[PDB]
Structures are given as structure tokens and as C-alpha cells.
Design an enzyme around this catalytic site. Structure first.
Site, mmCIF file in Angstrom:
data_model
loop_
_atom_site.group_PDB
_atom_site.id
_atom_site.type_symbol
_atom_site.label_atom_id
_atom_site.label_comp_id
_atom_site.label_asym_id
_atom_site.label_seq_id
_atom_site.Cartn_x
_atom_site.Cartn_y
_atom_site.Cartn_z
ATOM 1 N N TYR A 29 -71.899 -28.868 -5.975
ATOM 2 C CA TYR A 29 -72.992 -27.885 -5.787
ATOM 3 C C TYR A 29 -74.538 -28.365 -5.865
ATOM 4 O O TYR A 29 -75.309 -27.863 -5.014
ATOM 5 C CB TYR A 29 -72.719 -26.621 -6.846
ATOM 6 C CG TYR A 29 -71.432 -25.986 -6.277
ATOM 7 C CD1 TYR A 29 -71.373 -25.118 -5.410
ATOM 8 C CD2 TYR A 29 -70.412 -26.226 -7.072
ATOM 9 C CE1 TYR A 29 -70.301 -24.244 -5.211
ATOM 10 C CE2 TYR A 29 -69.229 -25.504 -6.818
ATOM 11 C CZ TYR A 29 -69.081 -24.640 -5.835
ATOM 12 O OH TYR A 29 -68.004 -23.909 -5.620
ATOM 13 N N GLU B 168 -61.190 -27.875 -12.216
ATOM 14 C CA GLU B 168 -62.265 -28.112 -13.040
ATOM 15 C C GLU B 168 -61.895 -28.020 -14.397
ATOM 16 O O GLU B 168 -62.745 -27.421 -15.105
ATOM 17 C CB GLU B 168 -63.462 -27.224 -12.685
ATOM 18 C CG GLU B 168 -63.835 -27.457 -11.346
ATOM 19 C CD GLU B 168 -65.027 -26.556 -11.114
ATOM 20 O OE1 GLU B 168 -65.701 -25.713 -11.825
ATOM 21 O OE2 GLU B 168 -65.863 -26.579 -10.043
ATOM 22 N N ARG C 236 -57.345 -22.492 0.529
ATOM 23 C CA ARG C 236 -57.286 -22.684 -0.459
ATOM 24 C C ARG C 236 -57.373 -21.502 -1.493
ATOM 25 O O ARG C 236 -58.374 -20.912 -1.612
ATOM 26 C CB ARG C 236 -58.198 -23.885 -1.260
ATOM 27 C CG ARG C 236 -58.309 -23.990 -2.880
ATOM 28 C CD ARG C 236 -59.197 -25.179 -3.077
ATOM 29 N NE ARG C 236 -58.924 -25.365 -4.766
ATOM 30 C CZ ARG C 236 -59.926 -25.306 -5.562
ATOM 31 N NH1 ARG C 236 -60.966 -25.160 -4.783
ATOM 32 N NH2 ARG C 236 -59.693 -25.310 -6.812
ATOM 33 N N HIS D 7 -56.641 -21.840 -12.205
ATOM 34 C CA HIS D 7 -58.015 -21.739 -11.806
ATOM 35 C C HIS D 7 -58.598 -20.590 -12.809
ATOM 36 O O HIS D 7 -59.014 -19.517 -12.391
ATOM 37 C CB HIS D 7 -58.399 -21.280 -10.578
ATOM 38 C CG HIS D 7 -59.606 -21.425 -10.030
ATOM 39 N ND1 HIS D 7 -60.021 -21.927 -8.749
ATOM 40 C CD2 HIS D 7 -60.756 -21.097 -10.722
ATOM 41 C CE1 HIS D 7 -61.160 -21.752 -8.587
ATOM 42 N NE2 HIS D 7 -61.905 -21.672 -9.702
ATOM 43 N N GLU E 25 -64.615 -27.544 -2.830
ATOM 44 C CA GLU E 25 -65.610 -26.284 -2.682
ATOM 45 C C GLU E 25 -67.082 -26.890 -2.481
ATOM 46 O O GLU E 25 -67.248 -27.902 -3.251
ATOM 47 C CB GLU E 25 -65.374 -25.752 -4.238
ATOM 48 C CG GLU E 25 -64.375 -24.941 -4.687
ATOM 49 C CD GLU E 25 -64.387 -24.380 -6.073
ATOM 50 O OE1 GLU E 25 -65.764 -23.921 -6.351
ATOM 51 O OE2 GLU E 25 -63.304 -24.454 -6.806
ATOM 52 N N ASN F 6 -65.310 -30.633 -6.160
ATOM 53 C CA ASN F 6 -66.066 -29.791 -6.021
ATOM 54 C C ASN F 6 -67.721 -30.132 -6.258
ATOM 55 O O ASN F 6 -67.759 -30.987 -7.080
ATOM 56 C CB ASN F 6 -65.869 -28.514 -7.051
ATOM 57 C CG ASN F 6 -64.445 -27.970 -6.813
ATOM 58 O OD1 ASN F 6 -64.007 -28.184 -5.741
ATOM 59 N ND2 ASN F 6 -64.031 -27.154 -7.937
HETATM 60 N N1 LIG Z 1 -73.048 -28.230 -16.944
HETATM 61 N N2 LIG Z 1 -72.053 -28.147 -16.375
HETATM 62 N N3 LIG Z 1 -71.214 -27.509 -15.462
HETATM 63 C C1 LIG Z 1 -71.197 -26.153 -15.238
HETATM 64 C C2 LIG Z 1 -71.201 -25.790 -13.672
HETATM 65 C C3 LIG Z 1 -69.890 -26.326 -13.164
HETATM 66 C C4 LIG Z 1 -69.410 -25.823 -11.952
HETATM 67 N N4 LIG Z 1 -68.207 -24.970 -11.975
HETATM 68 C C5 LIG Z 1 -68.390 -23.600 -11.800
HETATM 69 O O1 LIG Z 1 -69.553 -23.095 -12.133
HETATM 70 C C6 LIG Z 1 -67.592 -22.834 -11.169
HETATM 71 C C7 LIG Z 1 -66.375 -23.691 -10.150
HETATM 72 C C8 LIG Z 1 -65.261 -22.585 -9.797
HETATM 73 O O2 LIG Z 1 -64.100 -23.452 -9.110
HETATM 74 C C9 LIG Z 1 -65.548 -21.161 -8.872
HETATM 75 O O3 LIG Z 1 -64.617 -20.426 -9.401
HETATM 76 C C10 LIG Z 1 -66.825 -20.466 -9.295
HETATM 77 O O4 LIG Z 1 -67.088 -19.390 -8.592
HETATM 78 C C11 LIG Z 1 -67.899 -21.710 -8.705
HETATM 79 C C12 LIG Z 1 -69.296 -21.172 -9.390
HETATM 80 O O5 LIG Z 1 -70.009 -20.692 -8.036
HETATM 81 C C13 LIG Z 1 -67.702 -23.003 -9.582
#
Ligand SMILES: N=[N+]=NCCCCNC(=O)[C@@H]1[C@H]2[C@H](O)[C@@H](O)[C@H](O)[C@@H](CO)[C@@H]12
Ligand SMILES: [Cl-]
Ligand SMILES: [Cl-]
Length: 443
Positions: A293, A164, A75, A119, A349, A291
Site C-alpha cells: 500500500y 498478514e 480472492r 483473514h 492486494e 500486499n
Molecule cells: N505498521 N504497520 N502495518 C499496518 C498496516 C498493515 C496493512 N494491513 C492492513 O492494514 C490491512 C490488510 C487486509 O488484508 C485488508 O483486509 C484491509 O482492508 C487492508 C486495509 O486497507 C489491509
């Protein structure tokens, strides 16, 4: 032993601004991340995506890392202002040439590409005309989407429209922490609405241009748990899940309106006749990418905006400070099944940042990322046994990269990048993951 189903897709992911560098090469326009990151105070240490991992030049090597590990999907994202430097109009043929090569090389190596259309690298020219806040973005978004479907849709059969949109809208336009760096709740809830309009137009146009493709959308998700068993905290959770997770978008896509709590908090912030756009918004999608985390403990708090606050817990955390709660991934997967029953789900992710060092032996011993990954993969496995239609799982990320407002201080890769030299070293997690792929699961 936890063996995944036959034909399950094992992937790694990246995004264009985070790894490519050469943002203004070969005709490309500026994006809102080039401008934002070049603004002082926005990004830790003043990092920018100017060089990054220099994937613009090192792409063939990086593909070669994927193949060598035997990972079967990839991806990546496409930079809109490399394709249309003014956001609309004249096509930058050398932007196409960049992605065609990548894509052709993936196909000749037996790697199934999954393409993210958007993105976060909005063209700067479109930002000057309101960006996500302008209803005309749907048309800018469809025009752009069609160039991509027409040029790649013969070879790329697996498409994601938005990565997102909660983050794009809320982090970019309410908190002001991501590009375009704005703090205005009324604009923020316009952007949410317009991202939906935009998605739905691209899917429409997808149906008219691609044979035998599938097209979905990607959402960030957190595992919200309540701070006590008070009905006020249990309701804090219901709001968080509706606002921050997939329903904010799936209630409209599958139901024809925003979720109930979301509408209690925000009806005043949404455009007048928002509901008139809902029919078009329910354009049929083929999958949901999730996604995932981290987890958060949540309470009712009347001082706080939106009446909810977070509550620190003493759980292990990553370098980002994110509480590690691998059962969140099981929970989000059961819940999306239970709530909206999409016909296919991917984990688009999952992964983690730790302070990786290279050792005297020349290796990166990242048992901390192995632990993290194993626990989440085991949890996803359990969701499949309970009937969730989980078709694949992508690791964020193939490579250490430019972690948005965090810069290069956060390393999420399974491949270490020395930015002084641009050297790639495979981490121990990379070797582990390669055997997960070989064994189609945990052993
Ligand atoms: N409150 N609240 N929510 C905030 C946190 C939402 C999660 N999204 C992101 O931080 C980005 C997303 C992206 O696809 C990637 O490009 C980024 O590298 C990752 C971060 O490691 C995740
Ligand atoms: Cl430009
Ligand atoms: Cl408007």
C-alpha cells in the site's frame, strides 16, 4: 505500452468479515471481530460487521459484477466460525453450502478462485482458550484447514493460509487496535511464532489432501526509506523491513531462524525453545503473496520503542493518510526475489481509499484511484521485466467494505456501495481496470 506476460492473472480481493454481514446466521459461531467491534470505543462510529455489504445474500450479483468486468480471479476468505462454530468439532454444513455455491458460480463463469483460509475472523471459543497465544492453535488450525481442503480442494486449486500474520500478531496483540485487542509484547511474539507453526501444519495437511494445488502465504509490506544517510537511520530501515515485512516470516520459512535484527530486539519475548519448531516450519510453499500500500520515512530514535520512529513527508496521501509511493511495489518485488527467491510471487492486494462521492450523472469519478492503480501496475510491470516471477495482481477491493477499526469511513472498492440501499455502482476505476484486464496491461 506495458503488456504483461501471457497467462498473467488479473484479480480482485475481499475478506469475509469485511463484506458478508450475517455473522450469526445459519448456525455460525461468534468470531473475535464480532465481539471486538461490538465493544464500545474499538471501531470508529461504532460500526460492526453485522450487515456490511450483505454479501451473505448479495453474492450472486457481486460475482456477476466480476464476470461483467471480465476480471479473471477472485480472492476471497472463509469465515472459520461459520465452518466450525466452536473452532473445532461439529461442522456447520450450512457454512459449507455458502462457499460451495460461490465457488461453483465462479467456476461456471470462468473465474479462478483464490481462497484465503484465515483473514482475521478467529472463532470466539478459541479466543477464550488463548487464541493465537496458545500452541494448540496449530492443531485447531490444521483441523479447520483439512475440512476446507477435503470439501473444496477438488475445485479450489489456489490456496492462501494466512493473510498478514504480522498484522494478526502485532496489531491484534501488541498495539491492541485489532481483535482480540490486546497490548502485551510477550504474547505478541508468541502469536508470531504460533502463526508460523499453524501455517506450516496446514501446508503439510495440504500435501496429503489436494491434488494438483498450490498453496502460499500473504504478508503486508511497506517501503521503508531512510531519513538521512546516517548509518543509524540506514540500520532503522533494515530493522523495519525485517520486522514489518515478509522476512520476519521468510527467514524462518527459507532460512530456519528469525531475521538478525528482529532477534536483537526480541529474543526475550519469544518462547524458550522456539528454534526447536523451525524444521517443521520449513514446510515447502509454492508462492508468496505480497500486499502493498504505502511508504514510510524512518529514523533512528532512542526514546522510541524498538529505537525507530516514523517521519512525516509531504507526498500525496490517501484517505487513510498513507503516503503514496508507487516505486515501493517495485522495490518489495525485487527484494523478495533477491532475498529468498520464491518460485512464484503474487500481488495479493494493492489499492486505495479516497472519499468517493456519487455525481449528478450517477457515476463515481475516482481518477485519484486510477492514478494510484496505474502507477503501481506500471511499477509491477518493471519488476517482471527485471526477472521477478510475478504471476498475478489482485486489486483490494472489489467492493467498498468494513475497514476494520476504521469502519465504513474508508472506501477501497472499485465498486461503490450505498449502505442505505446496498446499491452497487461501478466506479470509473472499475471500468478502467476492466480495460487493463482486456488489454493485459497499460496502453
Ligand atoms: N505498521 N504497520 N502495518 C499496518 C498496516 C498493515 C496493512 N494491513 C492492513 O492494514 C490491512 C490488510 C487486509 O488484508 C485488508 O483486509 C484491509 O482492508 C487492508 C486495509 O486497507 C489491509
Ligand atoms: Cl458462538
Ligand atoms: Cl501454550
Amino acid at each position: 505500452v506495458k503488456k504483461f506476460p501471457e497467462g498473467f492473472l488479473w484479480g480482485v480481493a475481499t475478506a469475509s468479515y469485511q463484506i458478508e454481514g450475517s455473522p450469526l446466521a445459519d448456525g455460525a459461531g461468534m468470531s473475535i471481530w464480532h465481539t471486538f467491534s461490538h465493544t464500545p470505543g474499538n471501531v470508529k462510529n461504532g460500526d460492526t460487521g453485522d450487515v456490511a455489504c450483505d454479501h451473505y445474500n448479495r453474492w450472486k450479483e457481486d460475482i456477476e459484477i466480476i464476470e461483467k468486468l471480465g476480471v479473471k480471479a477472485y480472492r476471497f476468505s472463509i469465515s472459520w466460525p461459520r465452518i466450525l462454530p466452536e473452532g473445532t468439532g461439529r461442522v456447520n454444513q450450512k457454512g459449507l453450502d455458502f462457499y460451495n455455491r460461490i465457488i461453483d458460480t465462479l467456476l461456471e463463469k470462468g473465474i479462478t478462485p483464490f481462497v484465503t483460509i484465515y483473514h482475521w475472523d478467529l472463532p470466539f471459543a478459541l479466543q477464550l482458550k488463548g487464541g493465537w497465544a496458545n500452541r494448540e492453535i496449530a492443531d485447531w488450525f490444521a483441523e479447520y484447514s483439512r475440512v476446507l481442503f477435503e470439501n473444496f480442494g477438488d475445485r479450489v486449486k489456489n490456496w492462501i493460509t494466512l493473510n498478514e500474520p504480522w498484522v494478526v500478531a502485532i496489531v491484534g496483540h501488541l498495539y491492541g487496535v485489532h481483535a482480540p485487542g490486546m497490548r502485551d509484547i510477550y504474547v505478541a511474539f508468541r502469536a508470531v511464532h504460533n502463526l508460523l507453526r499453524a501455517h506450516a501444519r496446514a501446508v503439510k495437511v495440504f500435501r496429503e489432501t489436494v491434488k494438483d494445488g498450490k498453496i502460499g502465504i500473504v504478508f503486508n509490506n511497506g517501503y521503508f526509506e531512510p531519513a538521512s544517510e546516517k548509518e543509524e537511520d540506514i540500520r532503522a530501515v533494515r530493522f523495519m523491513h525485517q520486522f514489518n515485512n515478509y522476512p520476519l516470516f521468510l527467514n524462518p520459512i527459507y532460512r530456519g531462524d528469525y531475521p538478525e535484527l528482529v532477534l536483537e530486539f526480541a529474543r526475550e519475548y519469544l518462547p524458550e525453545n522456539y528454534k526447536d519448531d523451525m524444521s517443521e516450519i520449513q514446510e515447502k510453499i509454492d508462492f508468496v503473496g505480497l500486499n502493498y500500500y504505502s511508504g514510510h520515512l524512518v529514523k533512528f530514535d532512542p526514546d522510541a520503542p524498538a529505537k525507530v520512529s516514523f517521519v512525516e513527508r509531504d507526498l500525496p496521501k490517501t484517505a487513510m493518510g498513507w503516503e503514496i509511493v508507487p516505486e515501493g511495489i517495485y522495490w518489495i518485488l525485487k527484494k523478495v526475489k533477491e532475498e529468498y527467491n520464491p518460485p512464484e510471487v503474487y500481488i495479493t492486494e494493492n489499492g486505495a481509499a479516497f472519499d468517493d462521492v456519487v455525481s449528478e450523472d450517477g457515476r463515481v469519478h475516482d481518477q485519484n484511484r486510477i492514478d494510484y492503480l496505474k502507477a503501481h501496475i506500471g511499477q509491477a510491470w518493471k519488476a517482471i521485466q527485471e526477472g521477478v516471477p510475478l504471476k498475478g495482481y489482485f486489486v483490494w477491493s472489489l467492493l467498498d467494505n468494513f475497514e476494520w477499526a476504521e469502519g465504513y469511513s474508508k472506501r477501497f472498492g472499485i465498486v461503490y456501495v450505498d449502505y442505505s440501499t446496498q446499491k452497487r455502482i461501478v466506479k470509473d476505476s472499475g471500468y478502467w481496470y476492466s480495460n487493463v484486464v482486456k488489454n493485459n496491461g497499460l496502453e
